Amino acid sequence: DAIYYPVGDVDIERGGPALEVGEEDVLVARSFNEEDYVLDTIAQYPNDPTLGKLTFMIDLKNQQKDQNVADFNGVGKSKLTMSLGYKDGNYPSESQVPIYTSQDVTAKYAVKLRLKGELLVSGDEWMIDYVYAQLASLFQPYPPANFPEVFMCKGGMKLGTFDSFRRTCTFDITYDRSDLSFSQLYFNLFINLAGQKRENRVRLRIDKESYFELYEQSE
Numbered sequence: 001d002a003i004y005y006p007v008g009d010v011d012i013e014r015g016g017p018a019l020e021v022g023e024e025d026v027l028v029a030r031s032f033n034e035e036d037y038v039l040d041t042i043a044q045y046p047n048d049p050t051l052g053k054l055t056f057m058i059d060l061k062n063q064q065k066d067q068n069v070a071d072f073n074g075v076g077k078s079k080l081t082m083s084l085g086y087k088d089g090n091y092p093s094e095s096q097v098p099i100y101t102s103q104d105v106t107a108k109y110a111v112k113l114r115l116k117g118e119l120l121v122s123g124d125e126w127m128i129d130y131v132y133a134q135l136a137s138l139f140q141p142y143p144p145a146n147f148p149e150v151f152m153c154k155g156g157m158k159l160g161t162f163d164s165f166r167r168t169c170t171f172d173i174t175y176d177r178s179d180l181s182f183s184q185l186y187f188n189l190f191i192n193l194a195g196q197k198r199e200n201r202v203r204l205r206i207d208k209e210s211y212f213e214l215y216e217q218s219e
Contacts (some may be wrong), residue, residue: 002087009156015177019110024218031062034210044199055083058189096139098184102117110178116207126195127166137182
């Protein structure tokens with residue numbers, strides 16, 4: 001009966017080729033890091049103590065903003081948000097938050113990013129059921145392979161390397177493509193853990209090499 005949105009070993013990349021940034025292109029957003037940081041948050045469902053499943057997503061952020069661009073939601077520390085419930089993998093509307101918001105339909109965009117780090121569950125009573133990174137003009141479109149709105153989707157062993165028990169996933173992915181159109185741009189991790197308990201202490205290390213850049217392309 002559950003609304004359940006798994007993505008396995010998927011590797012989707014869309015867009016024009018890597019932008020060779022020229023004099024007329026404009027950097028409209030850039031975030032980066034000077035050191036590693038770790039998100040460390042207990043995952044659990046309020047109001048439902050049913051054991052065995054934790055579905056959550058990560059708003060992906062970097063701590064430094066390029067001082068020549070406007071503030072944007074991709075600046076800060078990454079954070080974890082539970083799905084609507086144990087049997088509902090959707091997210092509340094108020095949590096469906098874009099990294100960047102466009103104000104001009106005619107704009108064409110290019111993105112350069114690196115996402116490097118590690119997801120770790122705590123202890124030995126949980127495993128990673130699925131995990132994927134997604135850049136898209138929609139929030140959690142499903143199945144993502146069916147949407148041209150999905151620009152980058154990297155899941156499972158296409159996202160990173162797991163330990164023997166799938167307690168950890170260590171990743172280092174890049175994306176560099178152009179000619180993108182959107183109203184709103186989303187950059188997230190979508191995760192589900194399966195296990196024997198009601199909660200887990202979840203850690204996500206974002207390595208200092210992680211960064212995000214957005215260009216408006218010269219027409």
